[PDB]
Amino acid sequence: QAGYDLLGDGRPETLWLGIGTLLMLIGTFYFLVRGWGVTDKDAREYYAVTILVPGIASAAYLSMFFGIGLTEVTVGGEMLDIYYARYADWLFTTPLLLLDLALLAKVDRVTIGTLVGVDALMIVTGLIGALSHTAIARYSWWLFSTICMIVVLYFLATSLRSAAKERGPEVASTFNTLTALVLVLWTAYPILWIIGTEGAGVVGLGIETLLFMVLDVTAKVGFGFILLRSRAILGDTEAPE
Ligand SMILES: *C\C=C(C)/C=C/C=C(C)/C=C/C1=C(C)CCCC1(C)C
Ligand SMILES: CCCCCCCCCCCCCCCC
Ligand SMILES: CCCCCCCCCCCCCCCC
Ligand SMILES: CCCCCCCCCCCCCCCC
Ligand SMILES: CCCCCCCCCCCCCCCC
Ligand SMILES: CCCCCCCCC
Ligand SMILES: CCCCCCCCC
Ligand SMILES: CCCCCCCCC
Ligand SMILES: [Ca+2]
Ligand SMILES: [Cl-]
Ligand SMILES: [Cl-]
Ligand SMILES: [Cl-]
Ligand code: NA
Numbered sequence: 001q002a003g004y005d006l007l008g009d010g011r012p013e014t015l016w017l018g019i020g021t022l023l024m025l026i027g028t029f030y031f032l033v034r035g036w037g038v039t040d041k042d043a044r045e046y047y048a049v050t051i052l053v054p055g056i057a058s059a060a061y062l063s064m065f066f067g068i069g070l071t072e073v074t075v076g077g078e079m080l081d082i083y084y085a086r087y088a089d090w091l092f093t094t095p096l097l098l099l100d101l102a103l104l105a106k107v108d109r110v111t112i113g114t115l116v117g118v119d120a121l122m123i124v125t126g127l128i129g130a131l132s133h134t135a136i137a138r139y140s141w142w143l144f145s146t147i148c149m150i151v152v153l154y155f156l157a158t159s160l161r162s163a164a165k166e167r168g169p170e171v172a173s174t175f176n177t178l179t180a181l182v183l184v185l186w187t188a189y190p191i192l193w194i195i196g197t198e199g200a201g202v203v204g205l206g207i208e209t210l211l212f213m214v215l216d217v218t219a220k221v222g223f224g225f226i227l228l229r230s231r232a233i234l235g236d237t238e239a240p241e
Contacts, residue, residue, distance in 0.1 A: 001208030027221035
């Protein structure tokens with residue numbers, strides 16, 4: 001694979017996992033330090049949710065870097081590498097990102113339940129795809145998972161957007177900016193998966209790891225940066241519980 005075998009264990013992709021680890025750690029510490037000087041009760045909720053996003057990713061990236069939770073899946077002759085921690089990361093962090101958006105929109109607990117439920121299904125069916133031993137199964141689970149993603153994105157772009165709008169221009173502008181980012185960035189994930197080692201195998205494990213790393217840092221640190229510098233986080237929130 002494209003990269004450099006940093007730890008001398010036959011894995012060129014550790015170059016990208018190592019860089020990922022550092023950027024996630026730096027992002028976590030940045031938000032944490034900025035968080036310390038925040039007193040508004042609403043701002044503090046946004047900081048708490050948002051710090052955990054690169055924080056959990058940091059742990060997953062460190063694990064993958066050291067080769068913890070790495071295994072092989074047989075698809076005929078081919079043995080595919082699967083990093084379990086990638087999926088565990090996404091399981092925890094995608095709901096947290098959706099919670100940030102739901103707090104801005106100030107939607108009800110049932111709406112939030114639906115959003116995070118379909119999101120969880122997206123990730124789980126992604127994992128089933130990655131562990132499947134035939135081509136037909138892998139592509140089928142990918143498609144099912146992609147339909148779940150579209151449902152999530154549709155809810156953001158319609159129901160949550162309309163709710164955010166009535167909270168006035170500050171909240172609405174921040175919501176719209178973040179949703180514009182999400183609609184593009186999240187859609188890149190299924191594309192990379194199907195052209196990479198898990199799908200068609202046009203791109204190898206090296207390039208794939210690199211590009212997931214860029215997506216992850218943008219979707220987590222980039223998202224957090226835009227959110228936490230907005231005045232909208234001072235506005236009233238109502239957590240689902
Ligand atoms: C780390 C932060 C984010 C926002 C990660 C997002 C990941 C996805 C949107 C993954 C989606 C997938 C789909 C739709 C199809 C199967 C494979 C994936 C799990 C990568
Ligand atoms: C309170 C407003 C939101 C409640 C919406 C009720 C309908 C629920 C739709 C469920 C969609 C799940 C998709 C499963 C994967 C395709
Ligand atoms: C109102 C529409 C809501 C649902 C949108 C889901 C599809 C997202 C399309 C964005 C495609 C970006 C491709 C970027 C890859 C380089
Ligand atoms: C033999 C040593 C090869 C070293 C290759 C270094 C290439 C540059 C790496 C930059 C990775 C992109 C970081 C993106 C940050 C979001
Ligand atoms: C003024 C802020 C300085 C410290 C910010 C730390 C963030 C480190 C992560 C690298 C940023 C990549 C995010 C991509 C932005 C689109
Ligand atoms: C042979 C040493 C390679 C070290 C890679 C550093 C990457 C800088 C971003
Ligand atoms: C305060 C830093 C965030 C920690 C997130 C949880 C990962 C450690 C087990
Ligand atoms: C919670 C972070 C996991 C990092 C594992 C380190 C293992 C050292 C060999
Ligand atoms: Ca307030
Ligand atoms: Cl404050
Ligand atoms: Cl307050
Ligand atoms: Cl490669
Ligand atoms: Na290595």
